[PDB]
Design a protein around this ligand. Sequence first.
Ligand SMILES: *[C@@H]1O[C@H](CO)[C@@H](O)[C@H](O)[C@H]1NC(C)=O
Lengths: 48, 46, 48
Amino acid sequence: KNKCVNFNFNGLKGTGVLTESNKKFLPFQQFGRDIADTTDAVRDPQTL
Amino acid sequence: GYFKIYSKHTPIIVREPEDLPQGFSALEPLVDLPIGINITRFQTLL
Amino acid sequence: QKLIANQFNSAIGKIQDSLSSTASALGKLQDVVNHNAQALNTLVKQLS
Ligand SMILES: *[C@@H]1O[C@H](CO)[C@@H](O)[C@H](O)[C@H]1NC(C)=O
């Protein structure tokens, strides 16, 4: 948390700062894309 | 491939067979099952 | 002198009335920002 780190979440790659969410996600979805295909929030697979 | 199901439960008040009401309601998915079944018809169960 | 001054004051006071109304008086300044936003929106929408 709070550090620029390479990640690999169920196949997709990317580089970013994995901080907290403070979101209101409905429990049937995984991705959180805002305008384009950039990934704002991706759900964890173990902790969910 | 798989068979998806979308639904939403909503309590309303209406004439009991007639005039499906106004408004908007988004249908959330609940359970997806990965089957390879061809479906051409379906029969309701009352 | 007083008639010209009163006419100038009555014409200046109507400028703020004509500018705060009709909701589309400053269209030549809004269209430039609208074009510069539409180009930047099209440049991201073609990344998908
Ligand atoms: C395994 O994944 C599940 C996800 O349902 C999680 O609840 C559990 O804590 C995980 N166990 C370990 C040891 O990571």
